Amino acid sequence: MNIGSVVFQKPIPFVVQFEGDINGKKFSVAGKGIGDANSGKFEGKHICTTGDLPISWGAIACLLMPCFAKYPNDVPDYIKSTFPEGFQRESLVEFGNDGRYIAKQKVTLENGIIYNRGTITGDGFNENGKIMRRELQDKVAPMLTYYYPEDDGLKCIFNQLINGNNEDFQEVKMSQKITPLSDGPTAPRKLHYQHITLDLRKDSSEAADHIVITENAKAVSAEKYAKACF
Numbered sequence: 324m325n326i327g328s329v330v331f332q333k334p335i336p337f338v339v340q341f342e343g344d345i346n347g348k349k350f351s352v353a354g355k356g357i358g359d360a361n362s363g364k365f366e367g368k369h370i371c372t373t374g375d376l377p378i379s380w381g382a383i384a385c386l387l388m389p390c391f392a393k394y395p396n397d398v399p400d401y402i403k404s405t406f407p408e409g410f411q412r413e414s415l416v417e418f419g420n421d422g423r424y425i426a427k428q429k430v431t432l433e434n435g436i437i438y439n440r441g442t443i444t445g446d447g448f449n450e451n452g453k454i455m456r457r458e459l460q461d462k463v464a465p466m467l468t469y470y471y472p473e474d475d476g477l478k479c480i481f482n483q484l485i486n487g488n489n490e491d492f493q494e495v496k497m498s499q500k501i502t503p504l505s506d507g508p509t510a511p512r513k514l515h516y517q518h519i520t521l522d523l524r525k526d527s528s529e530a531a532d533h534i535v536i537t538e539n540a541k542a543v544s545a546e547k548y549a550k551a552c553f
């Protein structure tokens with residue numbers, strides 16, 4: 324029995340706070356939403372409080388809470404087991420023929436609200452590229468992500484494809500490391516996958532530069548994934 328399973332048994336509001344600096348361009352994002360780990364759906368609206376986001380929203384979409392993923396019982400939920408204290412995650416995000424950035428974030432539970440507080444720092448992006456000129460669509464293709472133990476944390480590796488405006492795609496390569504914020508007991512770290520679909524949309528009434536992320540994440544054991552029907 325893992326304690327985190329009880330806190331996420333009902334939908335929980337969440338708050339996202341990000342500070343960024345990519346190619347010397349500083350930005351700040353503030354968002355809020357709701358996550359339901361019973362369904363694996365969590366949806367939030369995020370606004371760039373410093374003006375316009377210097378990069379395509381899709382490039383930071385899945386950094387703006389894998390604790391909300393729907394985990395079956397035949398998969399040990401390590402991420403939820405780190406609660407109530409929470410977890411931290413470091414990410415190396417590399418874009419094909421463009422730059423890279425590093426993010427560090429801490430996902431905590433405070434007064435019954437999930438807080439995703441993170442920081443992004445990157446450089447080497449093409450100033451005439453579709454990322455920094457924001458010519459990519461706000462559309463991200465479906466994903467499968469790999470989870471597996473490494474050292475004393477849970478490592479996650481996966482790719483992302485952001486649609487371009489001319490039948491092209493932008494490659495996103497991510498390498499993440501999840502570790503607990505406390506030295507308390509956690510669930511087993513075992514190989515498994517997450518099936519994620521993102522839908523980025525805009526609010527007509529919102530004047531600020533923003534994005535509305537509808538995410539549906541489900542965990543799959545390696546035995547059930549191998550026996551999959553599509």
Ligand SMILES: [Cl-]
Binds near residue numbers: 427428429440441442
């Ligand atoms: Cl941080």
Ligand SMILES: [Cl-]
Binds near residue numbers: 423424425445446
């Ligand atoms: Cl870097």
Ligand SMILES: [Cl-]
Binds near residue numbers: 502
């Ligand atoms: Cl570790």
